[PDB]
Design an enzyme around this catalytic site. Structure first.
Site, mmCIF file in Angstrom:
data_model
loop_
_atom_site.group_PDB
_atom_site.id
_atom_site.type_symbol
_atom_site.label_atom_id
_atom_site.label_comp_id
_atom_site.label_asym_id
_atom_site.label_seq_id
_atom_site.Cartn_x
_atom_site.Cartn_y
_atom_site.Cartn_z
ATOM 1 N N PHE A 128 6.147 -3.472 7.578
ATOM 2 C CA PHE A 128 6.991 -2.531 6.858
ATOM 3 C C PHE A 128 8.391 -3.101 6.704
ATOM 4 O O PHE A 128 8.897 -3.767 7.608
ATOM 5 C CB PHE A 128 7.069 -1.188 7.588
ATOM 6 C CG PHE A 128 5.792 -0.410 7.558
ATOM 7 C CD1 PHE A 128 5.469 0.365 6.465
ATOM 8 C CD2 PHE A 128 4.912 -0.461 8.618
ATOM 9 C CE1 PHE A 128 4.297 1.078 6.433
ATOM 10 C CE2 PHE A 128 3.737 0.250 8.588
ATOM 11 C CZ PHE A 128 3.431 1.019 7.494
ATOM 12 N N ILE B 11 3.222 7.322 12.965
ATOM 13 C CA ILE B 11 2.437 6.568 13.929
ATOM 14 C C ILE B 11 3.345 5.958 14.994
ATOM 15 O O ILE B 11 4.567 5.819 14.818
ATOM 16 C CB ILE B 11 1.583 5.482 13.250
ATOM 17 C CG1 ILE B 11 2.421 4.640 12.288
ATOM 18 C CG2 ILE B 11 0.408 6.117 12.524
ATOM 19 C CD1 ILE B 11 1.644 3.544 11.610
ATOM 20 N N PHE C 70 0.795 -1.216 0.000
ATOM 21 C CA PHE C 70 0.000 0.000 0.000
ATOM 22 C C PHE C 70 0.832 1.273 0.000
ATOM 23 O O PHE C 70 0.268 2.354 -0.199
ATOM 24 C CB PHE C 70 -0.949 0.025 1.209
ATOM 25 C CG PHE C 70 -0.253 0.175 2.529
ATOM 26 C CD1 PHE C 70 0.055 1.426 3.026
ATOM 27 C CD2 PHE C 70 0.085 -0.934 3.276
ATOM 28 C CE1 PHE C 70 0.691 1.564 4.237
ATOM 29 C CE2 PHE C 70 0.721 -0.798 4.488
ATOM 30 C CZ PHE C 70 1.024 0.451 4.968
#
Lengths: 820, 372, 387, 107
Positions: free
Chosen positions: D99, D56, D36
């Protein structure tokens, strides 16, 4: 997974994916930057830039991906720049001073025969910059709730790299078109050229191309005409009609650039010329003052000039085109000659001044359009329209400048920053014209209006604002929202309230603004059919502000507009308010609260600057009597109970709950029916008293004035006015060891209601007999003056009732006693 | 205090002075400049080229650029739509086409005939390319809404009909009878009903507005920027009635009858009676305005101008009626005999008698007496 | 059943059309004459203007339309000179009355009363009605004269078609309601016979009638055809054929499949259930296509349409109807909801990768150059993240 | 949450300190394995400063444990990720994020 290139043979998947790209474009269409950021996750920059160069994609997918890139990254910026591109706000800077119509060359000494390359050079017109935000999906979500965060910016894509890639693809396309291969990129010449040309046109309109880039584009369009001191340009390649449409868009951009250059050159010349004129006039005035009574008549004969307004001084000083003597126009011959030479240059640049090779943009465009139309029976109506619009612009060069100048404005350097900020806000507001109003759009609109109001330029340059057409845009937004769900409650009442605060201050800013808004009175009156839900400001308030305290406008007011307002008032006096009925208010059979607004508008229309406007007053009186239901149930023919009885009944209603309100509150119960009825009748009496004729007319004995006065007397008896003026008011009283028992001003009989009756009595009946004066003093005025005096103690001094009594006295009563 | 107070231009800020200079220069130099490009443009667009090199054997020779432009505008007019959106391109090109047909001691007979032949050729350049059909289609499409679109259309129609062009008249009549559309005459009737007459309330309001004078510097302020409110559309009314007259000019019995009864159409509109109705309205307005000025010894300048406007319009309407009836068109003669024309004539006779007797006694109004 | 004088846009609708029927069969198309008795028939409803002793001027059914009650005549003046009688002529006769020009007074032959307007009573002016009830009066007024205006063949044919179609579809609806809730078990359908063949033929004929003009026509002819199509669509909608089609679809929707329908109507009738429902949806699409008014009618009941999207008998037809509505009406777009968007996406999920669903979703986002941010956000959030 | 798994070793000594600016490449995937986001797709390192709450909590806590030049996989639970709200149109509600992060340099 498969290779996307397999969709050349898998047609069903090709169709579905092309329509998926269409859906991607739709969900971000028209400035949905948040959805554009979201789509940057699904179709990323690498994919887009790879598809741009992929020479094996099917035509539908190639076009879809080009359009997707434009929609995601370029559409909103291009649209905002396009919206701003039709106005020329030239800042008076050294860069502006350096602008000249023709390049400083020597081809021809006067009006150098050769133009400069269109779109290449210095432009000073103010265009707000572009703002982009990096696409990142690991940043913390703004904790700020929805409708609070700043509007998202378009996702950023490297513009210099995109620019280079676009130019390279265009060059490759031109070479391939020249070669005439049998496997065109995308499957056809159309799918090879149209996407690239769309990208290039978007980038040009955005104005990201540099001077070298623009020169390369021009040489691609036509190598010979746009040479600088493949030989087949785009304009001669036997292209399809869609490619011709894109070429027309490019030529339109370059013609607009030449027009902008003309306007900027004119402004740059105007600065120097007006400076010279001012210096000349200062010197002349110095000499005139030095002249010691040479001849008083002579002195007056010169000085009227300096007594005249600056606009007429300018006109007089410039009125020498066909020749004039030193008396008619004092400008020296050299000063005149400068303007004459510039006029010659401007005509030459426009082409007025009067080859097989065009040798200029004007000749190129004309010859190309005529050649296309001669070669083929063009089938695309859009192509035909673009072709002939271009041809008209090329032939009527001077007319284009003439029609463009009204939108040209020059500002000082000190105003550039504020003007840029105001242009930002206006761009936001204009962008809100293509989106259906929602909460976030409402908030953005309100913030933009607030910034515009707090901006200094909004007040100092009202002509600039009329030229920009801010009032038209705000009115259009307001009307869109009002019409939307007009049958039901109007959403976004805060936005409509702002729609005044802006427009409905804008009328006050200057008299010309008031004219501009007055020109749309019927529009506002048309859209003001339903209101009062706002509790703020309304299009009816805009209409009133557009005529308030302006005799020239009140005299231009139209009988059909007055009829519309009168019909609305009749409807209000005949049918109850649906909103109140839904809220649960008892049905009383009519709408005092709307009737009051309509009566207020008519009051502002008939009474100006403390003097009645007879033309409007007579019309209003005639309409009101022709629709007696406007007078309300009290003044009805048969069942009418009389004004005094109606006011007393209203007071009883006010004191009786379950008959004054729902009986089950931002304004503390909003409307109280008793106060609504009292206010309606007070407003009606005020309107009639203001429609009453003037004393000088009555003394002259004009038949119409006497007839109108007689009609008003018939409608309102004197005894009713005296009774209402004699009705007692509630006075704040101390109780319960410190409890101030103050009457609720918004729900009881207040002094303004009596002030209206005093106005009517003074203007229609008038006090002329000592016995009557003493009677009125004894019964109605003196008790109120005594109450006001008694409220002078420290506790009650600042109460709302005390202040209302003071205003009532000092504005209605005491002046009458002074007169009598 | 303005008399003593000075407002020299040299004290005004530079940018404000620049804006004033731009406005002035625009009004005084650019606007006054006269460029005549319409003839050149129409000639260039009418010339076809290279038809010989492609040697198209299709007898339907492709339309030349001017023909294509006219066809595009006919397409726009024929598109089914609720209203006719204002189109600057159409207005500009209609003005160009209208100016292309110029209609310009004692000039010789040969000179007169030669000018006539030029005008016929110029009108042919247009009506050989569909201009007449386009004009009719646009008048029908306006749907009786006054505006710049219909003004330009009417001016173009007059331009191509001037001199009683028989060929253009025949083309227009054939188109109307072939299409059998009621829209054209419905639009004409609606426009004729919207045509305005003398309004005394507006006149008095204008008088009071003029009597008011701006206190602050007039030029710096609105300066009483009030346009003519009394018969503001006199030009449009004259254009409409000139167009109707030009349709019948030359004793064209076919139009003289068609303007009265459209046989093929489902519903007919009697344009003769509509003209009579407008004339009656105008006569009543003129009588009211005379009664307003009856007591006053002399008529002031604005009153004279309003009389002149109303009287020019009335003259045009009378010419249109005469063109309807001459030939003679017995049907139109009977229709007018059974109309309200007699009342209008009676009112006009009263006004003529009294206005002549009054205007004679003064010499400053000989021009108004002549026009009467 | 009542007659009014209405002046709104009804002057172009079909409920203001009347047919003149002389009291004779041979040469009934002859030139109409003053004082000639005749009936006046309401084309759309098939009812005859008449005088009932108990209710005054009404429109009565043909069965009750005897000559005494339903005979009228046109007179050039209200003077009592009808004493002289008239004799039938075997030919076109002399032309007497003209369209538009002649002004005619309608008189009831039997009673002699005059067709006139009732005195507008109060509170009706207050509501704002522009309709004045018509009545038969001994004296009437001075402006009782009427002018006759021809209607074009298009409206005449459309009105007659509306009459016949209304009759047929009402018969169909009554037939369905006959066995609405009466299981046949293993025997008779237990109800009225269904006009299956007539309904199918009528639906096919009307679909051909409302067929849009072909894109290959020249521009002017295409425009004329489009104007005619819009006019006929408006006529049918204003006479309520749209509501009739919706009612038929409602009655037929109770049954989930042909077998379920058979369990109430019989196998022979059920053999045409799928065809009839598909034809009804095609007719609905033809009626609303391109017509903004008809499309905007669905704003009040959009759920009625969206809830049917998953029906398997007429999936394509229902999707086409939705496409037309969304393409033409912005009002519907302003009321679209998250549940509607989820249903449209479930079409993609359950029926496959059909690009027409994508077209519908695209049309939900923008209409006439205006974007609906709520719809855009809902589509994005409910379609993209799943991948 | 966040759990860090080394992919390629770093210097092992220089760790980000509060207030420093970390330059990284990353490739984001949902727990299903659907990409994404990726800075390498845009061909430009992502820069962020620790302690300013720009990224975040998963990044804030994870990148702090990586040495300069280190490549590592960060698995971040929903609570440390966008969580219940979910970045609309990109990240579904209650999604775990994976990630692939390379810490190029500090500045």
């Amino acid at each position: 997974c498969m290779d996307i290139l397999e969709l050349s043979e898998r047609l069903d998947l090709q169709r579905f994916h092309s329509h998926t790209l269409s859906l991607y474009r739709s969900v971000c269409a028209l400035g949905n930057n948040r959805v554009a950021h979201a789509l940057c996750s699904h179709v990323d920059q690498a994919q887009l830039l790879h598809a741009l160069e992929d020479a094996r994609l099917p035509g539908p997918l190639r076009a879809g991906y080009y359009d997707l890139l434009i929609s995601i990254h370029l559409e909103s910026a291009c649209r905002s720049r396009r919206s701003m591109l039709s106005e020329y706000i030239v800042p008076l800077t050294p860069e502006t001073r350096a602008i000249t119509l023709f390049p400083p060359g020597r081809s021809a000494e006067d009006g150098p025969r050769r133009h400069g390359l269109p779109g290449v050079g210095v432009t000073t017109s103010l265009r707000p910059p572009h703002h982009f935000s990096p696409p990142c999906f690991v940043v913390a979500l703004p904790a700020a709730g929805a409708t609070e965060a700043p509007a998202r910016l378009s996702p950023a894509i490297p513009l210099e790299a995109l620019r280079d890639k676009a130019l390279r693809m265009l060059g490759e396309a031109v070479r391939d078109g020249g070669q005439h291969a049998r496997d065109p990129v995308g499957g056809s010449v159309e799918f090879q050229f149209v996407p690239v040309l769309k990208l290039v046109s978007t980038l040009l309109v955005m104005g990201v191309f540099s001077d070298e880039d623009v020169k390369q584009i021009l040489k691609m369009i036509e190598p010979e005409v746009f040479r600088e001191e493949l030989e087949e340009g785009l304009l001669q390649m036997k292209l399809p009609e869609s490619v011709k449409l894109q070429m027309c868009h490019l030529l339109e951009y370059f013609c607009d650039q030449e027009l902008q250059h003309r306007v900027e050159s004119l402004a740059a010349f105007a600065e120097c010329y007006v400076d010279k004129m001012q210096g000349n006039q200062r010197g002349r005035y110095g000499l005139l003052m030095k002249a010691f009574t040479m001849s008083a008549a002579e002195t007056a004969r010169r000085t009227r000039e300096f007594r005249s307004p600056p606009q007429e001084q300018i006109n007089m000083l410039l009125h020498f085109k066909n020749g004039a003597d030193e008396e008619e126009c004092p400008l020296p011959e050299e000063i005149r000659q400068e303007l004459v030479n510039f006029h010659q240059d401007l005509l030459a640049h426009c082409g007025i001044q009067l080859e097989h090779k065009p040798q200029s943009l004007q000749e190129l465009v004309s010859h190309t359009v005529v050649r296309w139309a001669q070669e083929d029976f063009v089938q695309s109506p859009e192509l035909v329209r673009a072709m002939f619009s271009l041809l008209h612009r090329q032939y009527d060069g001077l007319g284009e400048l003439l029609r463009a100048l009204p939108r040209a404005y020059t500002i000082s350097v000190s105003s550039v920053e504020d003007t840029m900020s105001l242009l930002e806000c206006l761009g936001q507001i204009r962008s809100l014209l293509i989106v259906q109003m929602g909460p976030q759009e409402e908030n953005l609109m309100i913030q933009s209006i607030g910034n515009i109001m707090n901006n200094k330029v909004f007040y100092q340059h009202p002509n600039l604002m009329r030229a920009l057409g801010m009032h038209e845009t705000v009115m259009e937004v307001m009307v869109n929202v009002l019409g939307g769900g007009e049958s039901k409650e109007i959403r976004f009442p805060k936005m409509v309230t702002s729609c005044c605060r802006f427009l409905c201050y804008f009328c006050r800013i200057s008299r010309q603004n008031q004219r501009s808004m007055f020109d749309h009175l019927s529009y506002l009156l048309e859209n003001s059919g339903i209101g009062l839900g706002m509790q703020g400001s309304t299009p009816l308030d805009v209409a009133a502000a557009s005529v308030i305290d302006n005799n020239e406008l009140a005299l231009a007011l139209q009988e059909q507009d007055l009829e519309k307002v009168v019909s609305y008032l009749a409807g209000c006096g005949l049918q109850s308010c649906p909103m109140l009925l839904a809220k649960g208010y008892p049905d009383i059979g009519w709408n005092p609260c709307g009737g009051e607004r309509y009566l207020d508008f008519l009051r502002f229309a008939v009474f100006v600057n403390g003097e009645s406007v007879e033309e409007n007053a007579n019309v209003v009186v005639r309409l009101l009597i022709r629709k007696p239901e406007c007078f309300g149930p009290a003044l009805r023919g048969e069942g009418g109970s009389g004004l005094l009885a109606a006011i007393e009944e209203a007071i009883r209603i006010s004191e009786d709950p379950a008959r004054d309100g729902p009986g089950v509150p931002p304004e503390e119960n909003r409307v109280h029916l008793g106060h609504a009825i009292m206010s309606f009748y007070a407003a009606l009496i005020d309107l009639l008293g203001r429609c009453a004729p003037e004393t000088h007319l009555i003394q002259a004995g004009k038949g119409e004035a006497l007839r109108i006065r007689a009609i008003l007397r018939s409608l309102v008896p004197l005894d009713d006015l005296v009774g209402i003026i004699s009705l007692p008011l509630q006075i704040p009283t101390l109780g319960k060891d410190g409890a101030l028992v103050q009457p609720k001003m918004s729900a009881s009989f207040v002094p303004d209601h009596k002030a209206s009756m005093v106005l009517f009595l003074d203007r229609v009946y008038g006090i002329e007999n000592q016995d009557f004066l003493l009677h009125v003093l004894d019964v109605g005025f003196l008790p109120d003056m005594r109450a006001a005096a008694s409220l002078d103690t420290a506790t009650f001094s600042t109460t709302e009732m005390a202040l209302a009594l003071n205003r009532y006295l000092c504005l209605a009563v005491l002046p009458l006693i002074t007169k009598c | 205090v303005a008399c003593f107070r000075m407002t020299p231009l040299y004290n005004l800020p530079t940018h404000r002075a620049c804006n004033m200079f731009l406005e002035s220069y625009k009004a005084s130099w650019i606007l006054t400049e006269d460029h005549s490009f319409e003839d050149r443009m129409i000639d260039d667009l009418s010339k076809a080229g290279e038809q010989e090199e492609e040697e198209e054997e299709v007898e339907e020779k492709k339309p030349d650029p001017l023909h294509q432009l006219v066809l595009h505008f006919s397409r726009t007019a024929l598109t089914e739509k609720s209203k006719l959106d204002e189109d600057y391109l159409y207005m500009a090109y209609a003005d160009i086409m209208a100016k292309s047909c110029h209609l310009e001691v004692e000039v010789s007979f040969e000179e007169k005939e030669m000018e006539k032949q030029r005008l016929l050729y110029q009108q042919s350049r247009l009506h050989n390319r569909g201009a007449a059909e386009m004009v009719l289609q646009m008048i029908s499409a306006c749907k009786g809404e006054t505006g710049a679109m219909v003004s330009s259309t009417l001016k173009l129609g007059i331009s191509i009909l001037n001199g009683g062009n028989a060929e253009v008249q025949q083309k227009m009549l054939d188109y109307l009878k072939d299409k059998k559309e009621v829209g054209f005459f419905q639009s004409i009737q609606a426009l004729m009903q919207t045509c305005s007459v003398l309004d005394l309330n507006a006149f008095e309001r204008q008088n009071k507005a003029e009597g008011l004078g701006m206190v602050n510097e007039d030029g710096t302020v609105i300066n009483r920027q009030n346009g003519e409110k009394v018969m503001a559309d006199d030009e449009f009314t004259q254009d409409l009635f000139r167009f109707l007259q030009l349709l019948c000019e030359g004793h064209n019995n076919d139009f003289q009858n068609y303007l009265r009864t459209q046989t093929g159409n489902t519903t007919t509109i009697n344009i003769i009676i509509c003209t009579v109705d407008y004339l009656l309205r105008l006569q009543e307005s003129i009588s009211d305005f005379y009664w307003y000025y009856s007591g006053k010894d002399v008529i002031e300048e604005q009153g004279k101008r309003n009389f002149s406007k109303a009287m020019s319009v009335a003259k045009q309407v009378f010419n249109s009626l005469t063109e309807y009836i001459q030939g003679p068109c017995t049907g139109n003669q009977q229709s007018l005999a059974h109309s309200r024309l007699w009342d209008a004539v009676v009112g006009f006779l009263h006004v003529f008698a009294h206005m002549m007797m009054k205007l004679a006694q003064d010499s400053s109004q000989i021009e108004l007496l002549k026009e009467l | 059943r009542l007659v009014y004088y209405e002046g709104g846009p009804v002057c172009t609708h079909a409920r203001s059309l009347w047919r003149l029927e002389p009291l004779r069969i041979s040469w009934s198309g002859s030139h109409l004459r003053w004082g000639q008795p005749l009936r006046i028939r309401h084309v759309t409803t098939g009812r005859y203007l008449g005088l009932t002793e108990d209710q005054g001027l009404v429109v009565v059914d043909a069965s009750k339309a005897h000559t005494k009650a339903t005979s009228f005549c046109f007179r050039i003046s209200k003077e009592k000179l009808d004493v002289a009688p008239k004799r039938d002529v075997e030919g076109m006769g002399p032309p007497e009355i003209k369209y538009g020009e002649s002004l005619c007074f309608v008189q009831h032959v039997a009673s002699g009363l005059w067709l006139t307007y009732a005195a507008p009573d109060p509170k009706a002016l207050r509501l704002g009605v522009l309709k004045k009830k018509a009545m038969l009066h001994q004296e009437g007024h001075m402006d009782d004269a009427l002018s006759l205006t021809r209607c074009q063949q298009e409206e005449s044919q459309a009105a007659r078609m509306i009459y016949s179609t209304a009759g047929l579809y009402n018969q169909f609806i009554k037939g369905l309601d006959s066995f609405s809730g009466k299981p046949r078990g293993s025997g008779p359908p237990a109800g009225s016979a269904l006009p299956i063949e007539g309904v199918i033929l009528s639906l096919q004929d009307l679909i051909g009638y409302f067929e849009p003009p072909s894109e290959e026509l020249q521009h002017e002819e295409k425009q004329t055809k489009l104007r005619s199509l819009r006019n006929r669509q408006s006529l049918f909608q204003e006479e309520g054929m749209l509501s009739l089609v919706l009612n038929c679809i409602d009655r037929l929707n109770v049954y989930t499949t042909a077998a379920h329908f058979a369990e109430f109507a019989g196998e022979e009738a059920a053999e045409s259930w799928k065809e009839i429902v598909n034809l009804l949806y095609e007719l609905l699409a033809s009626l609303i296509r391109g017509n903004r008014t008809n499309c905007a009618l669905f704003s009040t009941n959009l759920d009625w349409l969206v809830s049917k999207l998953d029906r398997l008998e007429a999936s394509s037809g229902i999707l086409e109807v939705l496409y037309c509505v969304l393409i033409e009406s912005p009002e519907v777009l302003n009321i679209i909801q998250e549940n509607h968007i989820k249903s449209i996406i479930s079409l993609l999920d359950k029926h496959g990768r059909n690009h027409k669903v994508l077209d519908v979703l695209c049309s939900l986002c923008v209409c006439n150059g205006v974007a609906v941010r709520s719809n855009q956000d809902l589509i994005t959030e409910n379609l993209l993240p799943g991948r | 949450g966040v759990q860090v798994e080394t992919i390629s070793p770093g210097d092992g000594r220089t760790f980000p300190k509060r207030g420093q600016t970390c330059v990284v490449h990353y490739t984001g995937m949902l727990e299903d394995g659907k990409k994404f986001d990726s800075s390498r797709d845009r061909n430009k390192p992502f820069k962020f400063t620790l302690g300013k709450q720009e990224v975040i909590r998963g990044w804030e806590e994870g990148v702090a444990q990586m040495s300069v030049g280190q490549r590592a996989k960060l698995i971040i639970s929903s609570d440390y990720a966008y969580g219940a709200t979910g970045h609309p149109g990109i990240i579904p509600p209650h999604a775990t994020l994976v990630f692939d992060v390379e810490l190029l340099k500090l500045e």
